[PDB]
Amino acid sequence: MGFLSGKRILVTGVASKLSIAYGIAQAMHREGAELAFTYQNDKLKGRVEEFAAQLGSDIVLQCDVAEDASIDTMFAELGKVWPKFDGFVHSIGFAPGDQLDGDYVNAVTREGFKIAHDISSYSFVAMAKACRSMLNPGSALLTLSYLGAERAIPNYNVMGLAKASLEANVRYMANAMGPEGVRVNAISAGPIRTLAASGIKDFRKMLAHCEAVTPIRRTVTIEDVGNSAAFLCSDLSAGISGEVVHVDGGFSIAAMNEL
Amino acid sequence: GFLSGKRILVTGVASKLSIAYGIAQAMHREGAELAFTYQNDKLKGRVEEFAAQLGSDIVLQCDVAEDASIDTMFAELGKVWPKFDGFVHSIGFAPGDQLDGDYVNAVTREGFKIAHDISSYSFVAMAKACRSMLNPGSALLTLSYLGAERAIPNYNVMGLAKASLEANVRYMANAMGPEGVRVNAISAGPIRTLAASGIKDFRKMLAHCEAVTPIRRTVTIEDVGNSAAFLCSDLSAGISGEVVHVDGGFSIAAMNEL
Amino acid sequence: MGFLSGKRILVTGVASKLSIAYGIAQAMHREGAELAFTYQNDKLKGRVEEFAAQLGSDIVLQCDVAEDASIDTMFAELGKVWPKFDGFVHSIGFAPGDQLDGDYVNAVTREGFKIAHDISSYSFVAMAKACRSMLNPGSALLTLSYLGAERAIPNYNVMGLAKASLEANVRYMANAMGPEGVRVNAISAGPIRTLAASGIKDFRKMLAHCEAVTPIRRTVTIEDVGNSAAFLCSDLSAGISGEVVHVDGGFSIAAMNEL
Amino acid sequence: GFLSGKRILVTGVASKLSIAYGIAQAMHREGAELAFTYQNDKLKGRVEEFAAQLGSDIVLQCDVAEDASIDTMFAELGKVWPKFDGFVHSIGFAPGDQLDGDYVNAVTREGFKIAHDISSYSFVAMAKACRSMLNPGSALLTLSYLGAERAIPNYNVMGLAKASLEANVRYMANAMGPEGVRVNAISAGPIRTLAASGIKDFRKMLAHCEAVTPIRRTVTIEDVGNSAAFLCSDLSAGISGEVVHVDGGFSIAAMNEL
Ligand SMILES: NC(=O)c1ccc[n+]([C@@H]2O[C@H](COP(=O)([O-])OP(=O)(O)OC[C@H]3O[C@@H](n4cnc5c(N)ncnc54)[C@H](O)[C@@H]3O)[C@@H](O)[C@H]2O)c1
Ligand SMILES: NC(=O)c1ccc[n+]([C@@H]2O[C@H](COP(=O)([O-])OP(=O)(O)OC[C@H]3O[C@@H](n4cnc5c(N)ncnc54)[C@H](O)[C@@H]3O)[C@@H](O)[C@H]2O)c1
Ligand SMILES: NC(=O)c1ccc[n+]([C@@H]2O[C@H](COP(=O)([O-])OP(=O)(O)OC[C@H]3O[C@@H](n4cnc5c(N)ncnc54)[C@H](O)[C@@H]3O)[C@@H](O)[C@H]2O)c1
Ligand SMILES: NC(=O)c1ccc[n+]([C@@H]2O[C@H](COP(=O)([O-])OP(=O)(O)OC[C@H]3O[C@@H](n4cnc5c(N)ncnc54)[C@H](O)[C@@H]3O)[C@@H](O)[C@H]2O)c1
Ligand SMILES: Cc1c(CN(C)C(=O)/C=C/c2cnc3c(c2)CC[C@@H](N)C(=O)N3)oc2ccccc12
Ligand SMILES: Cc1c(CN(C)C(=O)/C=C/c2cnc3c(c2)CC[C@@H](N)C(=O)N3)oc2ccccc12
Ligand SMILES: Cc1c(CN(C)C(=O)/C=C/c2cnc3c(c2)CC[C@@H](N)C(=O)N3)oc2ccccc12
Ligand SMILES: Cc1c(CN(C)C(=O)/C=C/c2cnc3c(c2)CC[C@@H](N)C(=O)N3)oc2ccccc12
């Protein structure tokens, strides 16, 4: 049996076979986890139901984390089949597209800031609030961050602030929920060509740069991220909580490799 | 003094205890000309009195919850200072019920929204509204706290909002550097100001810090004021995007209390 | 088969059943790795040979990392049975005991500094130099650090500087060896009652403090560290290099939990 | 100036390009009295000339490889300054063959030993030898580089030695804080001094930094000098154990060159 046997894990954020959440789901399934899936809106319904069935799952529930009621209804439905479960993968990041091009100070707005932080940071702890009493001891929560939290990256703009808020959220959630038996961590992934790359100019040349200066001399895949994610939601990682694990091939720890 | 010739807007003076009050005094002592904002009609009279005591006549209302308030303020400011040399952002707020008890239970969507809006977005909101008024060589400063970087009991959603604010420092420094503007923060140690109002065990916390801080005291608004004046002066020309810890070394020690 | 099948990993630093290296070895063995072991001096010979046999291993070699010749001879012997292999666990830390009590500036000496850095930092890259041509693509190197690298901890003294040197060593080794297919990481472990706790005053009260303020409300074990270590030397962690992973239950990411 | 009344020992002046030369000039300009050390007989005449130009007569040999040299120096210094207010450590060295090529191939046990001995241990060696001579309010300063925190090509074992040095800053600040002594570092951006001698592609590196640094220039010894003077002055009373980046914001940006 895999190292996720006996675990029930909810996975958010599967939008396509390219999604980081899809790679996480595949690895967790390979390691024996029973999975449940959410989807943002009705456009993704049929599609996520198909990915879920491939991964042994009947449990496919609508959840728009902009709305407290949607989160509450989704966990009420999940509780009909999983009265308790062992944690969830938060793989949800969003800012209005106009925020992510151009000079940051000119591009950012109060509303773009509000949405980026609400959807990409608040929603992680919103989900934890709503399922807190359903978690078993040994449970693990996981979210996905990016180096733009720690460094100023061109065009990433207000998403960098939202990810910095999210990484702090990881620490405060880990500190609050640890005593009752829940761990909370993040993977800071290197850039991956997913739907989150849509309309981001210079994304090809950006991946080429990472490929050149990353110590392992390739960019990471959703399979790399999936394997680390399965570890971090498994009991193998029982000694890790509140941690942001860089799964970017070492990109963040080198400088001036370009020359 | 080493701010002679600079014109610096100071937000956030609420009482003689305020961090911004200590910053303004230090900056005045080093020769800056100062302008002041006040949040609301409750605070106007105090800020006018303090401003007058530092030789300033420029006291303008600004509630950073409202874009129009920030715009109107900088329009008024431009009648007397068509250009100036930066501003001190000393504004932090979350609804008080956010700052008591288990973080996951206390946080709400609205408390989160407000904390991030008032404590983080307002810094770049201000920079947006005065960007064309900044001289080359200008400096912007904000105040952060160790709760950005570590989980501190009861600081709760303010820690996320400060983490957003420190990233804002980096993004703003990266964006405005090429125009000649630096952006930095001070991560101050705890100080008993109005920001301690209603906070559980604040005195026990200060006693802890005073015992484990390397300099064996907690910091004052004089200590923060002196570092702020440096970070807004041309002496710090080599420093941008930085969060400077002005906490007596508290953050760099561990298990000091065994 | 376990997630370390087809891997050959050399393990340094087993001194007793309490050693962090012993917990790492047990987990790697459980996950299907073939192991080889070193021992510092002849006092540990019989004992390490016994731990190794329990873990399926005939390969037990002397190695004192103070001496380049000892490291070279040991890898020449290892190459008779493992012409190539897949990485090693560096679990070796030492400073003269007088360095680790009292005010740091009064306790530290040039010689105590020299030894602490030589044995606890240089030896990691010494070992990599000496076996570089024996590593397969996919190989992984791992060392053990401690929070005293990042924070000033009473009495840890010059070992804090040596661990900071070691964590930088992790980054420079990862950057140099990544392109040929080798990853290099560290675990920063929370405190564990091992022989490395010998003669450290206040170690009981220190563990009690960690137990109280760690988010998971217990101190970590060599089994926690072993499971993370097996992950970091496995292909599951193919996207991680140059990283210092905190396996301390979240201790480092909280502050003022005491109150 | 803001160092009036302070007496500061400055190590590491080797040429007008040295970081320590810029520090000494800034400190003199702010009113400190200065004393100087020189490594060896080769450097004596230059350091005496520079010292005389800054009104100092206190020029003492000190090779931090030797405990007796440090002791003898502080014995000599105590004949004129029985107490003083801290020192600037601006000393970094690895054998040059360590600083070229693949790190794992270039590093050796002896090159490692020397880099850590001269660049890191010597800072606490100096503090040990003058500890009883430091006034309350004293400040110690050293110079680090981003290679402590990130793997930089060719910087090689100097990056480990700087990481050891920054931990030394923390441990020294923690140990000496309660006596009234602060200890900090400046992590300076690259500067073309004698420390660039023989270094591969140093000019290409500076061009890179000047393109991606937020302030769009590399830093000068004037920039570092001004920050050093602040960190050794009572204006920085709230700051100890800190590594202050004086690199124009270079370290806080990423992928700026796309
Ligand atoms: N792709 C990268 O380069 C990269 C690198 C590091 C981190 N990340 C982060 O990884 C996570 C997954 O992104 P991805 O790259 O897999 O792209 P993706 O577009 O496939 O996944 C993003 C998902 O967020 C979901 N989502 C957005 N708003 C939502 C809402 N209101 N309610 C519910 N769900 C909502 C979307 O439906 C989608 O399933 C994001 O947080 C992203 O910021 C991406
Ligand atoms: N006191 C500490 O321990 C401490 C330590 C580190 C950082 N900080 C931060 O320093 C800053 C100044 O806090 P303080 O300790 O001086 O307390 P304070 O209460 O004196 O000052 C906070 C100021 O924020 C202003 N403000 C709040 N909401 C506003 C709004 N919508 N528009 C305009 N102004 C608004 C208030 O009027 C007040 O002037 C805050 O950002 C605080 O988070 C405080
Ligand atoms: N025990 C803790 O609290 C803790 C926490 C974090 C990190 N660490 C680090 O974990 C690693 C393992 O320590 P441990 O706690 O398992 O204690 P241990 O005493 O069981 O292991 C230390 C090992 O280092 C070996 N060693 C020392 N000098 C050597 C030399 N010259 N040549 C070859 N080997 C030598 C010793 O023989 C011993 O096997 C060390 O690096 C330690 O600093 C320990
Ligand atoms: N130039 C840069 O790009 C840069 C950037 C950041 C930090 N640094 C660091 O700043 C410091 C000053 O370097 P610099 O750029 O001014 O170059 P420099 O060559 O002018 O100064 C280095 C000084 O170290 C002294 N020194 C070397 N070995 C010594 C010994 N055994 N005893 C006494 N003194 C010894 C030398 O005599 C010289 O005065 C070094 O620590 C350097 O690592 C340099
Ligand atoms: C790398 C990198 C990424 C990927 N990544 C780490 C993310 O977190 C991407 C979040 C992201 C959030 N909101 C978005 C979009 C993307 C665009 C699609 C559409 N969904 C949209 O309207 N809004 O995005 C970048 C943006 C600018 C610069 C660099 C990057
Ligand atoms: C230290 C420390 C501080 C001071 N400090 C760093 C801050 O940033 C304090 C921001 C803060 C924001 N909003 C607040 C208040 C304070 C309380 C008064 C009233 N103004 C209120 O309703 N809302 O506050 C803490 C709160 C909990 C635990 C520790 C601390
Ligand atoms: C925690 C903690 C540890 C454990 N730990 C993380 C280590 O890395 C311990 C390394 C260590 C190195 N050298 C030592 C010894 C230990 C003592 C046994 C004997 N082997 C000796 O002569 N020299 O040690 C501490 C020392 C002081 C304060 C706190 C701690
Ligand atoms: C930047 C940068 C620097 C400058 N700098 C931050 C330093 O700390 C430079 C220390 C340094 C230590 N020892 C040295 C030398 C220099 C060379 C001259 C001679 N003095 C020598 O034999 N030994 O050096 C680099 C070396 C490689 C790559 C990048 C850099």
Coordinates of C-alpha atoms in Angstrom, one line a residue, chain C residues 2-10 28 31-36 82 84-87 136-140 181 183 230 233-236:
Chain C
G2 CA 9.7 1.2 -1.3
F3 CA 10.4 4.6 -2.7
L4 CA 14.2 4.1 -2.3
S5 CA 14.4 0.9 -4.4
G6 CA 17.3 0.7 -6.8
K7 CA 19.2 3.3 -4.6
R8 CA 22.5 2.8 -2.9
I9 CA 23.1 5.3 -0.1
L10 CA 26.1 5.7 2.2
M28 CA 15.8 4.3 4.1
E31 CA 11.9 2.1 1.9
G32 CA 14.1 -0.4 0.0
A33 CA 17.5 1.3 -0.1
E34 CA 20.7 -0.7 0.0
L35 CA 22.9 0.9 2.6
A36 CA 26.6 1.3 3.4
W82 CA 29.7 0.1 -5.2
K84 CA 28.7 3.9 -8.5
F85 CA 26.0 4.9 -5.9
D86 CA 23.3 7.4 -5.4
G87 CA 24.4 9.8 -2.6
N136 CA 24.8 8.4 -10.6
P137 CA 22.5 10.9 -12.2
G138 CA 19.6 11.3 -9.8
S139 CA 22.0 11.2 -6.7
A140 CA 21.2 13.2 -3.6
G181 CA 22.5 15.5 -11.9
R183 CA 20.9 17.4 -5.5
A230 CA 14.4 9.3 3.1
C233 CA 17.3 11.4 -0.9
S234 CA 14.6 9.8 -3.0
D235 CA 13.4 10.6 -6.5
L236 CA 10.2 11.9 -4.9

